[PDB]
Amino acid sequence: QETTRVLTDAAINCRSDKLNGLKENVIIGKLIPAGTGINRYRNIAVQPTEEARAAA
Amino acid sequence: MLISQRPTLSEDVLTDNRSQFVIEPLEPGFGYTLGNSLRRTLLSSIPGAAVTSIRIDGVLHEFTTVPGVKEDVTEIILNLKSLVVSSEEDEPVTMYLRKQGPGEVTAGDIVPPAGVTVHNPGMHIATLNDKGKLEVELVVERGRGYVPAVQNRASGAEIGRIPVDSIYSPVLKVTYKVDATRVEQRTDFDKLILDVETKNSISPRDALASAGKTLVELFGLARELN
Amino acid sequence: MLISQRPTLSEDVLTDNRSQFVIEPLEPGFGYTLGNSLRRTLLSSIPGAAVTSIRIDGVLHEFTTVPGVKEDVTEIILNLKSLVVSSEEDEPVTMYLRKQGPGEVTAGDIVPPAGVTVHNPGMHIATLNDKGKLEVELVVERGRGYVPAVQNRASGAEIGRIPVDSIYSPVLKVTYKVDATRVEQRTDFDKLILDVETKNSISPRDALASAGKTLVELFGLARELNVEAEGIEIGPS
Amino acid sequence: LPKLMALELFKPFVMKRLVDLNHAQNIKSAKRMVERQRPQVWDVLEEVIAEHPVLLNRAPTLHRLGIQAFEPMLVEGKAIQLHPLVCEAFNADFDGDQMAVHLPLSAEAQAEARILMLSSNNILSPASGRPLAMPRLDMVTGLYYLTTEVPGDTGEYQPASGDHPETGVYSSPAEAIMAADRGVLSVRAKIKVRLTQLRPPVEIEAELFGHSGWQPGDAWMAETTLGRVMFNELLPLGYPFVNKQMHKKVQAAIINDLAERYPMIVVAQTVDKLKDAGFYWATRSGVTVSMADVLVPPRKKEILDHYEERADKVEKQFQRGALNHDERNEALVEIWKEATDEVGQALREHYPDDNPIITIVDSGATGNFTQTRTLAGMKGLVTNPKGEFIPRPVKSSFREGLTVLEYFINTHGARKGLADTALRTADSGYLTRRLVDVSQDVIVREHDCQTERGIVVELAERAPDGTLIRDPYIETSAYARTLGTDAVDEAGNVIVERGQDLGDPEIDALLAAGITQVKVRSVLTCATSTGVCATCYGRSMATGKLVDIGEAVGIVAAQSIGEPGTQLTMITGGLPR
Amino acid sequence: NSVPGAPNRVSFAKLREPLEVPGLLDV
Amino acid sequence: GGYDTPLGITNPPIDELLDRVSSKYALVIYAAKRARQINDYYNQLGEGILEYVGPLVEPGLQEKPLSIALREIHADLLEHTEG
Amino acid sequence: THKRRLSALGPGGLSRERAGLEVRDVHPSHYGRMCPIETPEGPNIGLIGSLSVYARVNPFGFIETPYRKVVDGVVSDEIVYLTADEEDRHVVAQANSPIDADGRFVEPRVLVRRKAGEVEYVPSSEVDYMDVSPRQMVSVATAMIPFLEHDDANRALMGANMQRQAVPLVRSEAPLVGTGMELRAAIDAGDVVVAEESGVIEEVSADYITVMHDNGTRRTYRMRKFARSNHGTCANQCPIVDAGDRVEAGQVIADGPCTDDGEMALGKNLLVAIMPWEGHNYEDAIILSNRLVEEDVLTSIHIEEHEIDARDTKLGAEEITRDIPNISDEVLADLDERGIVRIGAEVRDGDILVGKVTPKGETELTPEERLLRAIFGEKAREVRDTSLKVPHGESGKVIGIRVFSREDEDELPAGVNELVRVYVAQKRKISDGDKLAGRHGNKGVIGKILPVEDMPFLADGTPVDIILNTHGVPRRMNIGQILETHLGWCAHSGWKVDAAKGVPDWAARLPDELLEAQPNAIVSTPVFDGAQEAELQGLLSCTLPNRDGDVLVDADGKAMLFDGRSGEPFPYPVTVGYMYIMKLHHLVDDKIHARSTGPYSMITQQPLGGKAQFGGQRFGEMECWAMQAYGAAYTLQELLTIKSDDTVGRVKVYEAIVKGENIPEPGIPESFKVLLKELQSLCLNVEVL
Ligand SMILES: [Zn+2]
């Protein structure tokens, strides 16, 4: 509703925003923070166990 | 101990296309089984011959009728369905009828050529006025049991033609049961009591034969085959 | 008339007297028609030398257990019951084994004389106590299919040979069923399932052979009646 | 798998495939042939059919469950080909309905699926955690039937020695199986036997072995009805043994129990297998229906009567302008109520045990003793289509049949609730919905808020002479619970210790701790600043296990929460209140 | 009754209506 | 573990699988990353190829890369850890 | 139904967004006014209806119930159209009520609605008026199935509305049983060619028939066929008799549609029975024969009109030739001289249609092409190659030809000079799974098709029509289904009261006359009137045992067929019977859809759903929430992007796809991008970092 002022205040506030409320993600669209999609996770550090690779 | 004595194959004279069946001794335990089974069979490719699709004069799609009639191209069609002309050999066998004057679409009327025998060759089917003329161009067939009306497109039979189903299964209806003797002191077995009827194109045998055949047939495999 | 296809044995080896199979291609729908029955059939078609409403010794009212021996007939009996009695003299045959001094008792502890054998003789049976001895009254006999411990015909006339059981059917169980398959092509044609349980004595496969035989033999009749039949075909080999 | 379905759809796949068997040119080539619609299609069509998940739903929505992904296999018709439980669970009944479904895509996703709504994966009451899709009704009922004994039977164990043996005792199974098969008995009907593999429950083995009741061998005696035996046979091998008949629940409870003890998998394997056996019996058993079945409340009337004069007379009494129209009007009503019960009971009472009907419900199958009476005898009361009841009421019954009136009164609220239905359905979620958001995001921080402010607990309502008494609702709580601190024994020690889920066993020996509180790393005391910590939360029942790094129970519960509203009525009652 | 092409779907009239079927439709 | 036998799909049992590692998430993903890789390999395969090895264990028909991965996965051949 | 249908809403009328249930509310009065039961159904019941039965309505919008205006144990054999009111003043007598053959209801006391419709008892001696029959605030449709008094109104009205949704397949049948409503109802079809004169017959043939209006006088009264419904159905209108016979005005002449032997053909008096079976009549599940096929029992055909205009505009207009660009041959080797083929012609999907065509444009191409065309001399034309082609689930034979020209004067909308509209047959040969049913609301999907054999079946062989799970009715109510069906086999099978020596007591009464049933024959009963149980029951006892004077049937309801498969006996006796039903204007093609892709809102390029389109189902938000309950992210996200309207990946990965490769990983909410812009827009600038 209104928001409007809810607009103002902002630049007033000049704030940024936690950017977390999934809805956010929803908002943006940029995928959620969790579920299938997480930092730690989605930044995994993966690859084969050598030996096998060594095994060529 | 162990005991045997091959049972007692024996049909049971009855109506037309129809005389029961009885046999034993019978492994104290089973009857039904093959009882049905067979019965379950039967129904089995009751192989037969008969039409397929046909046609006549200006007989386009099925969605008018001929004058003189009181009738419907279709149910006509149906009625036809009632067919009952056991033929003979193999091929897209056919036939052709015509009419004139007061028309009376019954059975018994057309050109049953070679190896072609109706069974109620008269079976009314419809009728037309004194204008009750017409022809019919009619494509028999052999086969067995049902099949869906082909696509004459996928097929090719001319425009007026009308693919149809078949049902080559001259049987009528089955029924029977056991009677397992089995006397309660150890010394027992089953008792056979049977019957069906067909669509008056054969005797119980005939098929019945086919039965025993494809059966035994059915089992060479089943045998020690390996 | 011919298949335009052709089901086919599928051997499956599981155990000794248990192991599955199937056979296919399988136009719908007959496993029911067949197997099933066959389940019967075979099930039904299974000759074997089954025992006899037997007995042993002075107990015609010690109607439970015995000295020098801890077990009890019932126990004994299923233990009794338990047997790979392979034999031949299609008929009776009392048979007698004993042993004083304790120890215990397995199968072959006795003698299967003529046309009669064991397949388990280690088949323990009797754990002796106070060193007891005791021969035992035992007959067996063949046939297809087990026969129940019918109220034996002595109606008392017997010395105690108890209206026991006896399986003329050396088989041991069955399993199976139907499988609709290949549809676009073989417009969903049946698919088989063929396990079933025997005695050690033989493979399914075996009398199975006979089964299909046997089995057909019947049909011969129906079949053999007017060869003028259109009995649909497989093709040869 | 209505084939011509994504048959139609899938396409673009092979669309890149196809000419891979260079049989089209471009794709318009194929494609355009997709217009051609060519036997070849059905083929590698097959390939692409390669284990590919599926998108699925019928709305509405109640919660995450009501959807999953799967693998089918093409078939004709045009509707859809399913499972039971998948039903119910996913509710929608073959009243004439449908669903919604789409293309699993990014193996990213599809993956996701097999991970997730993977048919399997999908289990119990993740909200209320406890079990879910158990067999049921028919399935069950057939259960009951089998499960349910049949004393006074053929072959029925014969403790008739003294003149020869007794019989009913049987080493192997197929044994009398094979037999009785041999028309000789209806398993339902105890006798005697033995085992070696179908382990006994402990007790048995408890002494037979104590050391090891393993039945990978060691024969163990036996004796009952098979059937029940049958089932058994079908069960957690590693499990000892059961016996008896059981109820839907029961069973279920177990069941739950069962997998609880173990991994996914299997579970169904059985499950299915089970229903199957039923199914069989289902078909088996045999219980069509009869008007004949219309068992008859005897004197019944005379009771009626009774009430009639009761009121009646009373009618005269008020009639004297005695009191208010109502009150008396009630007492009247009461009178009825009285009847209500009486009729139902003694009615019921009368009929013999076996009437599948009731037996059904009786089988815990469903239904109610209302349906019971209601059905026949009387149908009881009715209320103002606007409120208060109906000064009649429902003397006769359907089965009996009645005039207009009556039914012509059914009519009203008939319309109404009906309507309600049409509403609670509506406002329900929305209500929720607001529920839906309200919070969200509110999820996991971590494992260990690291607070120290869980609360001791009630732990049953203890007791005087009874020493100890259990809140039922204990259970409602009591579990997925954190050793907020260290379960000490009766002073004697600290029976257990801060930080644990406090599972049944806990519940059980600790149960034997005759005590009634334990501080517990709940959560509302979540030290985790934002979000939450495992320690705080910890295990999902939905998991039956610990939670994860960041989790949306807010959903969940939110579902869990709203959804169930689902079905309530009614200083206010349902929701609004 | 009063039916030219009438057959009889024999019914269970325990009763009587001197009245008979209006024409509705009229309306 | 004498339970039974999976079926492509049911192949294999996460129950196991799961055991390998904690959160289903990456884990799966993880696999994602792989197959992705796999594909790539195949994606690239025919050409002045990249080093890209695998799919280690031999193939299995159309087998979704997906699987494959799944295989050497429970086959247990690579490593990882979040980010 | 549509007729008599009645409400009070809409133009100037109510707006359901404003009306208290009361609007829908019950109330006394109501009787003899409109079907208590039926109504709308969605948020809709209590909103609309019709009349009850008889009572005409005021020269001023108010019912006109006449009544058994009684007089001194001697009702005044007299209508009294009544506006409830008035009346209201008066005394509520009771139809179903035992008079001393004189008005003299033989009891001293009775009941009766009062001031508040106070359905109040009372001493017979006092009313002014009784009634006009039983059963009246009823509806026709209401008026349709007995056993009511045993059956769910809910379930009822359900079936009520249901009732309609039959589908005049083909065969023509009537429930051997059924009240009198029926054609005497059906007659109020007032449709069937039906007599006009006591004239002797005259020349006859399926178009009409000459009619010896015995005044010499005649008139080849007509008869229609093959002409669509609002719903794609023939004009069929089947005859009756013989060009020579002799009959009389108002009597029948020829059915046609819902018109079994002069009568709404409406279902199939059909065996089947009671089991819930192998889980296939479970959860609404439904287990179904097959012979049926073969039998055919289940089909008619259905009618689209098929249209496609010739237009006029900028670059030219919309020609309809038969020439075409690089069209296949046959594809053309088929239509008429200059487009579409010829009546009664078979097809399939895709199938091109029109002979259309239109100017294409004028905006160059790559030399590349042309060149190319020069490369292959395929000197392209330049006209918007345009026409029509058959979509999906579509075939049959040519029909319509409403090819109507503007140009040919055939007035038509702008920029067009003509248009045809055409039709094609298709005999719908009934899929299982689907749904049908009959009376007792007792709806029923159509689960599985099932070959004959393989089928429980008479000990006398003959198997089912299908079978029936159990369970519902209990928590449902409608068992007449049971009874009625008992009945069914009965009638179907006939009998005779062996009353002989004396009287089947319960007999001792009733339409005596029956005494028997010539195994199978016409059978009605009253609504709130019909025999009883015991009787009925005892009727059970009665019989017309078969051929082998047999009755596999039990004086009990449960016999014992065996298995058309495994075959053996059963556990216990077999409940069974018969039931006419009806068939459904609601199945797959009614709703058989999805959508791979197609059009997309030239604005919100979403799946431009449409005819050509499958719509492409919309998606819900909960749902999303479900995701959440997992978090497949992507997935959803994806969606949002993908099938949502990801212009790119759509294109892009669409490619990928095309190139089948570790897909263009999910990008960015793009558009969203816009935003920003959108913001800025208002001095809004900001940012994350
Ligand atoms: Zn925490």
Author numbering:
A (entry chain D): 1227 to 1282
B (entry chain A): 1 to 226
C (entry chain B): 1 to 237
D (entry chain D): 443 to 1012, 1024 to 1030
E (entry chain C): 30 to 56
F (entry chain E): 27 to 109
G (entry chain C): 450 to 1138
Paper's wording?
RbpA, essential in Mtb, is a component of transcription initiation complexes (TICs) that tightly binds the primary promoter specificity σA subunit of the RNAP holoenzyme (holo). The switch region sits at the base of the mobile RNAP clamp domain and, like a hinge, controls motions of the clamp crucial for DNA loading into the RNAP active-site cleft and maintaining the melted DNA in the channel. Here, we used single-particle cryo-electron microscopy (cryo-EM) to determine structures of Mtb transcription initiation complexes in three distinct conformational states, including a complex with Fdx at an overall resolution of 3.4 Å.
To understand the role of Fdx in clamp movement without the complication of DNA binding in the RNAP active site cleft, we determined cryo-EM structures of Mtb RbpA/σA-holo without DNA, with Fdx and without Fdx. The cryo-EM density maps were of sufficient detail to visualize the bound antibiotic in the Fdx complex and to determine the domain organization (including the clamp conformation) by rigid-body refinement. Because this complex is not interacting with any other ligands that might be expected to alter the clamp conformation (such as Fdx or DNA), we will refer to this as the 'relaxed' clamp conformation. The two Fdx-bound complexes, with or without us-fork DNA, show further opening of the clamp (14° and 15°, respectively; orange and red in Figure 5B). In the end, the best-resolved 3D class, containing 21,115 particles, was 3D auto-refined and post-processed in RELION. The overall resolution of this class was 8.1 Å (before post-processing) and 6.5 Å (after post-processing). We thus conclude that Fdx acts like a doorstop, binding and stabilizing the open-clamp conformation.
